[PDB]
Amino acid sequence: RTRAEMEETRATLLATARKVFSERGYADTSMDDLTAQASLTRGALYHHFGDKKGLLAAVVEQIDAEMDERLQAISDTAEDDWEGFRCRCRAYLEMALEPEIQRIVLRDARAVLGGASPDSQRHCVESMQRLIDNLIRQGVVAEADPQALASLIYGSLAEAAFWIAEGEDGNARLAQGVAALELLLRGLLVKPR
Amino acid sequence: RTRAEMEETRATLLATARKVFSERGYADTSMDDLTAQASLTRGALYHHFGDKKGLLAAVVEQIDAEMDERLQAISDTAEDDWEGFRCRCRAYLEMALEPEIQRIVLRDARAVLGGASPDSQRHCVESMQRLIDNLIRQGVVAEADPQALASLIYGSLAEAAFWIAEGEDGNARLAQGVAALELLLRGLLVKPR
């Protein structure tokens, strides 16, 4: 087997694990369950991922990449950059009600892996930093260190997403989160709108 | 041995572990090292804490309780409640440069335990919620769900503390963090100051 072939197989196993965990639940699904449900060869999942936690980490990495792409696209496509930033921040919270993110990232990875890795966190912060730097340069956002401000913003959103995902009434919590978020964000503006 | 006697001994071992980890470093200090340095009986630390990670969790729990007390006291003693809230928030960041918090909580527990437990997080949020509820009732802070707003605020502070503790220049990062924080907080006010 080549590296290329192994990488292709890993990707198929990861996609299938995501599909099964969606239908059945992560805690509910053992490695043997996944093997049976997906009609995989004995040992394939252990060979690629080591253990269930390893599989979960790999799934989370893919999900994270997808999230980053979706969020970057909101601010990239924005007609007004401040509104694009608000929309991106709100979208992060709105993702906490999507079943895969809610369950796999905000419940399962939270409990099993201890939440986002420090590396993943630094990555999210760097992305938000690019946006903040831009808005400061535009004179939209008041002067501050971009990286510092991005850490604060990312932290608020990450915690609020956990909180929304803890509710029996996530829909209610989402509206509350977004409304509170708007009060925090409005102070960033040089000139109120 | 009574429960009371075991609890007393546990507390002495925890205090000693804190002292040794301060002098020597958590990663640098094995359970056997701690046993030797503190002249403990063979097996005492394993008997009380199970493993090193268990000891670390127990140390973190004590540190957390101390932090909560210190922070609650800032807003309790405040002459102006808004300034007391700003001071409490800044103090959380300032704690990221204290050697024990910086190292044990923001570096070691981060890497080893995955940061604060969800329970610890909910506890911090409930404390901040009490304060926010008060400030909203006073008409100082604009209407919002207290728990939602506390989640956002706590998240910002927790992440910014990690960020400050990642720097080679924590002092520089602290000033940047505090300045950025002030921009986020100012939007909470009904009436600007």
What features would you describe in this structure?
Two copies of one chain form a homodimer. Chain A has 193 residues and is an all-alpha fold. Chain A has one domain (1-193): Orthogonal Bundle (Tetracycline Repressor, domain 2). In chain A, 77% of the residues lie in helices and 0% in strands. The longest helix of chain A has 26 residues, at 52-77. The N and C termini of chain A lie far apart (60 Å). The interface between A and B is large, with 40 and 40 residues. Chains A, B: Keywords: DNA-binding. Chains A, B: This is TetR-family transcriptional regulator.
Characteristic terms for this protein:
homodimer; 193 residues; mainly alpha; Tetracycline Repressor, domain 2; 0% strand; transcription; tetr-family transcriptional regulator; structural genomics; joint center for structural genomics
